[PDB]
Design a protein around this nucleic acid. Sequence first.
RNA 1: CGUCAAAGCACUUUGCAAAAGCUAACGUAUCUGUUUCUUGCCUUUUACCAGAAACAGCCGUUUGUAAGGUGUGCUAAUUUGACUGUAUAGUUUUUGUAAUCUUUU
Length: 76
Amino acid sequence: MIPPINFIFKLLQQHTPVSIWLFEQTDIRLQGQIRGFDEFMNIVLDDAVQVDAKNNKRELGRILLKGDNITLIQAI
RNA sequence: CGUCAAAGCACUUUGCAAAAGCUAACGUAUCUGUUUCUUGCCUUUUACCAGAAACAGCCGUUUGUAAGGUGUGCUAAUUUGACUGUAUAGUUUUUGUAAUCUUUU
């Protein structure tokens, strides 16, 4: 079987593009490649992009998120 | 170990009460006597032989309680009880996703 942090470890090596959803905000989402992370589920995204229901793709740069705000992490 | 409560504390002397509550050594010990019966050895009764049942004494044991004694402390020490006793800002409770607005009855 596949534990959750070992699954995220694969997303670092493969450098796969991953879109991230927020806690109490469906209107907003994010994108980017995963460089690194930690035990508390904080993430360092590279070439991250802010997306909406309108599809308003707005660029950001290399950012960091708090683990308290995530909900879904999905491949491609 | 920690908290709280009570109390002097440890050691000791007497007094006074108790000690099958659901089959169990108040004493991992153990002796004498009385009465009533049964058998022994016997004729003087006592003194005795060795079984029973029913009562008694004696040598001891434990507990609670009361007053004391010695040594120590009453600017402390010790005992005794009681307790829902631990420390976590990063995902399942105590360091917040909250804040704010509007319509309906």
